[PDB]
Ligand binder design. Structure first.
Ligand SMILES: CC[C@H](C)CN(C[C@@H](O)[C@H](Cc1ccccc1)NC(=O)O[C@H]1CO[C@H]2OCC[C@H]21)S(=O)(=O)c1ccc(N)cc1
Lengths: 99, 99
């Protein structure tokens, strides 16, 4: 689709058989999801945002269907204000900015 | 233009003197710029993201040129690590997400 920006670009994602709303966030290098259970090994990591640093759990090679488009990549789980889809997965679904 | 997301979507903006590099950020509701001493009235505000909140000064009706496109609107100013062009101005320069 083409998504305009008068409203937040929120879309439905499917991860681990669950449906969630997430924000298409071109300002995010990484994909960061609110606290949830994902299977498999994870690694403790830290990331910084506008307000400072948080601790996250890094899950590698996780499938997510974003608005009908398949991605398989790194997902960070931690205390983000909202689920964000960052550039690591936006590139996989062929997302660009246009003006 | 079309901007892929392999790299951070940084572009040149102008606000007065001062050309700056800023992120075209679909995840930011409002534009937030690094500390700078703008003229005019303003109001304090707190904006939240990963890590928590920062305090900013909200200036209204500030003209900004973004990649040669004219925009005018709210510009938040505070201790952000990166200059961020948010949705309030992205719509003004005709910017969409496409995939
Ligand atoms: C609530 C949604 C989202 C977290 C809001 N943020 C915009 C976001 O694009 C920031 C923009 C941002 C970029 C870089 C530093 C700080 C902020 N990115 C971000 O936090 O990304 C993190 C995930 O990947 C990593 O890559 C960048 C930092 C990490 S924000 O910076 O906090 C923000 C919040 C409110 C306004 N008005 C403007 C900006």
């Amino acid at each position: 689709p083409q998504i305009t920006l008068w409203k937040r670009p929120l879309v439905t994602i499917r991860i681990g058989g669950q449906l969630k709303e997430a924000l298409l966030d071109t300002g995010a290098d990484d994909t960061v999801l609110e606290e949830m259970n994902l299977p498999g090994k994870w690694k403790p990591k830290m990331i910084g945002g506008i307000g400072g640093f948080i601790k996250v759990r890094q899950y590698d090679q996780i499938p997510i269907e974003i608005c009908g488009h398949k991605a398989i990549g790194t997902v960070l789980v931690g205390p983000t204000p909202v689920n964000i889809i960052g550039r690591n997965l936006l590139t996989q679904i062929g997302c660009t900015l246009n003006f």
